[PDB]
C-alpha cells in the first residue's frame, strides 16, 4: 500500500519508420557494338548500387526502430526509473510484443520491381545483380523480434527446466517492463515457486488482484494449485480491456485448464513433444527452447536464431527496481 505513484505520460517519439514502397527500374533488354552494351551495363549497375544503398538505409532504419522498441534483456534494468518505463499503449503498433530474440525480419518495405520488360531475355549481368539484390537485401539481418502475445492465447514451450524457465523469465520481464498493470496482469501456478525462482515475481506490481489483502502483500497471484489459481482468477475473466498472462511451471497437470478467451494468453512448459501435430495454428504455437535457439513447430523452422536468457538474480533485480511505482 506504500509505494510511489506514476503518471500516464506521453510516449516519446520513436525513430521514424518510413514504410515507403521503393521501386527499381527493370534491367535492359539485351539486343550494336559491345562497347555500347558495356556502357549500359555500367550505368544500370551504378543505378542498382545506389538503390541498394537506399534499401540498406531503409533496413538500418527499421532495425533501429525495432531496437529502440525491444532493447536487449539486460538494458531494460535502467528502464523503470526513467520517464520511459511503461511507455507502451494499446494503440501503438508494437504493443504486447514480447522480445524473444534476434533473427531475420522480412524488411517491412516493399522493394517491388516494376516488371514490365516481360519475355525475359535480359542482359545476364544486369539481371543477375538484380536477382541477387532482390534475394539477399530483402531480409534485415539479426534484429529484435518476438511474440505478438495479444493474439496467441497459448504458448507451449518444450525443453529442460533451467532453459525453458530462462526464456520464460526473459520475455515475461520484457513484458512487465513496458506496460501499466492496469493493462496486463501476470499470474503463475508452480509447485516450487518460493525457491529463488519465480519468487522474484513477488515484487512485480503486475501480480496483484483488485482489492485483496493477504496481510503482507495485497494479492500475490502466485500459487501452486492451478485450480486455486483460477479461483483467485475467477472474477478477473468473463469476457469472451485488461490483458493477462498466466504461466505454468509443472510439465504435467493439464494446461488449457481455463477454456477450450479475449486477452488471457496462458503459457506452460512440457517435456513431451508432439508427434505429427496437425496444423500448428497461427495461435497456440509450440516452441522448443533449444540450446541457443527457440524453434517453432511447423509441420524444423528455427524462426528464432538467438534466444534470450535472464538470470534469476537479474529478474529479481528487475522486480525490485520496478516495485517502487504504481498507477491508479
Amino acid at each position: 500500500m506504500s509505494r510511489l505513484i506514476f503518471e500516464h505520460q506521453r510516449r516519446l517519439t520513436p525513430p521514424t519508420t518510413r514504410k515507403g514502397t521503393i521501386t527499381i527500374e527493370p534491367p535492359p533488354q539485351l539486343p550494336m557494338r559491345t562497347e555500347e552494351v558495356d556502357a549500359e551495363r555500367a550505368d544500370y549497375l551504378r543505378y542498382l548500387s545506389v538503390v541498394r544503398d537506399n534499401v540498406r538505409a531503409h533496413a538500418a532504419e527499421q532495425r533501429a526502430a525495432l531496437e529502440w522498441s525491444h532493447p536487449e534483456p539486460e538494458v531494460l534494468a535502467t528502464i523503470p526509473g526513467t520517464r520511459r518505463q511503461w511507455e507502451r499503449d494499446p494503440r501503438d503498433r508494437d504493443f504486447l510484443v514480447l522480445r524473444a530474440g534476434r533473427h531475420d525480419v522480412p524488411l517491412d518495405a516493399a522493394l517491388k520491381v516494376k516488371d514490365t520488360a516481360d519475355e525475359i531475355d535480359l542482359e545476364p549481368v544486369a539481371h543477375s545483380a538484380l536477382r541477387g539484390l532482390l534475394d539477399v537485401q530483402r531480409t534485415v539481418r539479426d534484429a529484435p523480434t518476438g511474440l505478438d502475445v495479444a493474439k496467441l492465447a497459448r504458448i507451449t514451450v518444450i525443453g529442460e527446466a533451467d532453459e525453458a524457465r530462462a526464456a520464460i523469465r526473459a520475455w515475461i520481464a520484457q513484458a512487465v517492463t513496458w506496460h501499466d498493470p492496469t493493462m496486463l496482469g501476470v499470474a503463475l501456478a508452480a509447485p516450487d515457486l518460493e525457491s529463488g525462482d519465480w519468487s522474484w515475481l513477488k515484487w512485480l506490481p503486475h501480480v496483484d488482484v483488485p482489492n485483496e489483502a493477504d496481510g503482507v502483500g495485497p494479492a500475490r497471484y502466485l500459487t501452486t494449485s492451478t485450480a486455486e489459481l483460477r479461483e483467485r482468477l475467477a472474477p478477473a475473466l468473463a469476457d469472451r480491456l485488461k490483458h493477462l498472462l498466466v504461466v505454468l511451471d509443472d510439465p504435467d497437470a493439464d494446461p488449457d485448464d481455463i477454456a477450450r478467451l479475449t486477452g488471457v494468453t496462458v503459457i506452460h512448459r512440457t517435456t513431451e513433444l508432439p508427434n505429427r501435430e496437425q496444423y500448428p495454428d497461427p495461435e497456440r504455437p509450440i516452441l522448443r527452447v533449444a540450446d541457443g535457439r527457440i524453434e517453432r513447430w511447423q509441420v524444423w523452422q528455427p524462426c528464432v536464431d538467438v534466444a534470450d536468457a535472464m538470470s534469476a538474480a537479474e529478474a529479481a533485480h528487475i522486480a525490485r527496481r520496478l516495485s517502487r511505482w504504481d498507477s491508479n
Binding site: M1, S2, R3, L4, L30, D121, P124, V125, H127, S128, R131, G132, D135, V136, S199, K202, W203, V216, G217, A319, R320, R321, L322, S323, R324
Partner: protein
Amino acid sequence: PIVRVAVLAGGRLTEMALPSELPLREILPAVQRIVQVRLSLAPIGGAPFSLDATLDTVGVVDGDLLALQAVPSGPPAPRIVEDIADAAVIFSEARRRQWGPTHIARGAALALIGLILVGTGLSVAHRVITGDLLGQFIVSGIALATVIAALAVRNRSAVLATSLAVTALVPVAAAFALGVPGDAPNVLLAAAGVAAWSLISMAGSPDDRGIAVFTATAVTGVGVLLVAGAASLWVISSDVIGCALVLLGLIVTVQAAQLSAMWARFPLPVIPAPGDPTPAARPLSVLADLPRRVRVSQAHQTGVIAAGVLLGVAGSVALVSSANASPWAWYIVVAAAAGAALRARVWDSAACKAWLLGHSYLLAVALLVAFVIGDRYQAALWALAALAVLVLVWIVAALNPKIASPDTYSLPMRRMVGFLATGLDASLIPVMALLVGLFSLV
C-alpha cells in the same frame, strides 16, 4: 503501514516485509529473529538510519535494499566529492603500464631480430672476403633456426610469428644465394628460396600481418627467378636482363588489380546462360567472410605494386649503371619512371600512391649508389641533382596545397596528362625492342 524490502546480512540476502510507522528500536530484534554491538538497517553506501525514527520518515520506498550493519561511533562521514575535468587522462595513465615483463617481450623480439641480421651480415662478409665452409654452414644454420622458430610460434603469438617470418627471408636469401660455388645462377636459387618462403608464410597466416611485404617479396622473387632463368640457360647482355626486368615490372604494375582480385579468391561471378537458366543466390557464409577478403585483396594489391616498383628499379639500375648504354636505355628508364609516377594518379590506396610516386626517388638513390660502386663519381653528382629536383617538386607540392589537387585544373589538361601516361608506357615496348636488338634479327 508495511513495506517489503530486501535485507542483507552467510553471504546472501533475504526478502521480508517490515512495519513502517514504528521506531527501529523494536524492529531490529525481530529482524534478527528472522535473519538468524549496535546493529541497524542502512541503505547501500549511506549512513545508517537514526535508531529512533521510522522507515516512512526516512523515505525508504517499497522494494529498496537495506543491509544490517553496525552503528558507527560518531559522525556520518558526509562523503565529500571532488570534481574532475579530463578523467580520460587517468585511463591513459593506467594503460601506460610500467616496465614490468611486457617490455621484456619486445626487447627479446628485437634482440632476436638483431641477432639474425648481424649473423647474416658477418657471415656474408666473411664469405665475400674469403668464404670457408663455416660461412655457408652458419648461414644455413641461422636460416633454419629462424624458419623453424617462425613455425614454432605460428599459433602462439600471431604477431611475433609474422615478424620472424619477415626477417627470416633475409638469411634464407643469403644462404641460398651462396649455397653454390662460383660467383649468375646463384641469384636464381636465392630468388627461388625467397619466393618459396614468402609463399609458405603468406599461405598459413591470418588476414593481415601477411601484409604487402610478403606478397611483394613473393612477386619480386618470381620476377628475379624468371630473369635469372634466361640469364642461366641462354647467355645475354646486361641490357637484355634490364629490359626484361623493367618490362616485368611494368606488366605487373599495370595488371595489379585483377591479379590481386584472384589472389584473394573472390566469389567469382555466376553470369548465367542466355537461353533459360536459373540464377543461384550466394550463401550467407562466404558473404559474411567477404569483408576479410577485401582487406586481403587490398594488402595483396599494395604488395604487388611495391614489387612492381622494386622490379622496375632493379632493371632500371641494370641499364644506366653500366659504362655507356645507348640513349634508348635512358629513354626506357625515364619512361618507366614517369609511368610509375603518372599511374600514381590512378590508384587510391595511400600506400599504393606513395609506393608509386616514390619510384622515381628510389631510382635516383639506386642510380647514385650504383654509380658510386662503379667509380663513376661524375654522373653521380648528376643523380644527386636530379634527386634534388625531385625533392624540390615534392616540397613545392607540399607547402602549396593547390598544385596537388586535380580539381584546380582544366578538363583538357588532365585529359592530355592521361594521353601522355598512355603513350609513354605504350611506346615503352618498341623502344625495348630497339635496344635489345630484336629488330636486328631481320
